Design a protein around this nucleic acid. Structure first.
Ligand code: ANP
Ligand code: MG
Length: 508
RNA sequence: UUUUUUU
């Protein structure tokens, strides 16, 4: 199917809620709901996508727009309009299915739908139910039955579960499917699930196998995504609506980016602690930040350090995939409203999450995929606000920074070195209450994580892996110490006859 | 159990 580009245009006639009302694109009832939110105007991606999504043409839509610029309402608005346009047809049936890569993002999109309901009660007849893992399955189905929603928001795993059992009852009249964070949902480990989802919806559809229109949204998207989505795009033509120049970097230009380079991976912990201390002092504790880490075990370790240093000054919140889902949801709600605090998380929080007035995004080590650099920093400087980001890495991670330049055109102007004083090392280390076995587990999680991105970030294995491993000795304040391990363990890893392996581990 | 993602 042919791709039709509509590139970023410089002198374009401004589209408004009023102009779309006058033109008959938007009904009064949705116009009213969005007007009462009192936004200055529609964001560029909203201006670009609303009419073409609702167009009577037989096309799919791909939309790219920078982090924090209103992609959610860019699809919710025309979805509501479609529901209004077809209000007498299949009114108890799901007409729009929106898929997201994390449960908390699916739940956020649902909350955005509820904000539309709150601004115009006449829209509550277009009901919405979220289908996400870690929630009571029966309770969500009671809700599907009671509310008979026209909009479903879901994560892939739970959506497949529901579809295998109830696709005939609720899903035979779907007209739109939305992949939010589309590039992520078409990576390995989501792509097959999206194909399963798309195949069921298409098979069960009462009109035809190609009825459903597909909408892809992300801040990080190109032509190569259309190829990946080939098996889920039904239509003969695909509009690529772009609000970013072809060569322009995808990172939001308002973010003040920097990188802090240490000699050792572990030193990035000390750099971050000293940075946060300074910010809490200089801002008089008026500090809201997000700090990203590579693994769940390390995230949790970092939280302990930051509670010991900073719990007297600011709340410290722990956010990753092993936090129970009830607590994930309650901490998201709190961090959205709070003026200050530090959210310490994995890439569970890299994409989509909208926490207002975050001042800074910090990163210890590299993200789980190159694109997530852009999404991580995009947690700040949202909806016209300012923001900064700091990447804390060691020397042996520098090829990541070069890869950002070569692959994504991101050049970080502010780069500086860091060397920890002996006093910061003593201060941080003394409060560490973890047993050596716990420290081994933590460092081992980092080894596995870094191993998996050696190729994509162009790391030198013989340097990055011994440096990560040496974190164990640093944290135990004895840099001669290697990680005690068994032969069978080393065999499983693949480093049993390697000098790299001998530099990292002691067969004990 | 290396980030998520039904159970
Ligand atoms: N027209 C508008 N004017 C001002 N703010 C808006 C407008 N539309 C949406 N917002 C707000 O902008 C914030 C971010 O919107 P959101 O839809 O989460 O951005 P996004 O493009 O999806 N970002 P990301 O998922 O990080 O790539 C939310 O708090 C919205 O309430
Ligand atoms: Mg979004």
């Amino acid at each position: 199917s042919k791709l039709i580009h509509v590139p970023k245009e410089d002198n374009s006639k401004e589209v408004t809620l009023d102009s779309l009302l006058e033109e008959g694109v938007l009904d009064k009832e949705i116009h009213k709901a969005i007007t009462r939110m009192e936004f200055p105007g529609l964001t560029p991606v909203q201006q670009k996508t609303i009419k073409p999504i609702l167009s009577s043409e037989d096309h799919d839509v791909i939309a790219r727009a920078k982090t924090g610029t209103g992609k959610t309402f860019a699809f919710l608005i025309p979805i509501f309009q479609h529901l209004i346009n077809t209000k007498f047809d299949s009114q108890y049936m799901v007409k729009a299915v929106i898929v997201a890569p994390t449960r908390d993002l699916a739940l956020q999109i649902e909350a955005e739908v509820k904000k539309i309901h709150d601004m115009n009660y006449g829209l509550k007849k277009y009901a919405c139910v979220s289908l996400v893992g870690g929630t009571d399955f029966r309770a969500a189905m009671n809700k599907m039955n009671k509310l008979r929603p026209n909009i479903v928001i879901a994560t892939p795993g739970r959506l497949i579960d529901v579809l295998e059992k109830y696709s005939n009852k609720f899903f035979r009249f779907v007209d739109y499917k939305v992949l939010d964070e589309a590039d992520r949902l078409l990576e390995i480990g989501f792509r097959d699930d999206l194909e399963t989802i798309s195949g069921i919806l298409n098979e069960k559809n009462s009109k035809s196998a190609d009825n459903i229109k597909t909408l892809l949204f992300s801040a990080t998207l190109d032509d190569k995504v259309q190829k990946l989505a080939n098996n889920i795009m039904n239509k003969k033509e695909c509009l690529f609506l772009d609000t970013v120049d072809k060569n322009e970097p995808e990172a939001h230009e308002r973010i003040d980016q920097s990188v802090v380079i240490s000699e050792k991976f572990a030193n990035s912990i000390f750099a971050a602690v000293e940075h946060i201390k300074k910010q809490i002092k200089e801002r008089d504790s008026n500090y809201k930040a997000i700090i990203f880490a590579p693994t769940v075990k390390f995230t949790s370790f970092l939280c302990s350090i930051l509670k010991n240093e900073f719990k007297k000054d600011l709340p410290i919140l722990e956010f990753h995939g092993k936090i129970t889902q009830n607590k994930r949801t309650s901490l998201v709600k709190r961090f959205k409203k709070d003026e200050s605090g530090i959210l310490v998380c994995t890439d569970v929080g890299a994409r989509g999450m909208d926490f207002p007035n975050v001042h800074e995004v910090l990163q210890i080590g590299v993200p789980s995929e190159l694109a997530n650099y852009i999404h991580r920093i995009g947690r700040t400087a949202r909806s016209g606000k300012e923001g900064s980001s700091v990447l804390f890495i060691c020397k042996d991670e520098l090829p990541f920074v070069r890869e950002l330049e070569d692959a994504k055109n991101i050049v970080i102007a502010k780069q500086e070195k860091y060397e920890p004083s002996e006093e910061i090392k003593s201060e941080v280390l003394e409060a560490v209450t973890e047993e050596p076995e716990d420290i081994s587990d933590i460092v081992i999680s980092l080894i596995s994580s870094y191993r998996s991105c050696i190729k994509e970030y162009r790391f030198s294995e013989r340097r990055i892996l011994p440096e990560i491993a040496s974190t164990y000795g640093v944290l135990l304040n004895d840099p001669q110490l290697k990680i005690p391990v068994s032969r069978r363990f080393l065999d499983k890893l693949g480093l049993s006859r390697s000098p790299i392996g001998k530099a990292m581990f002691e067969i004990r």
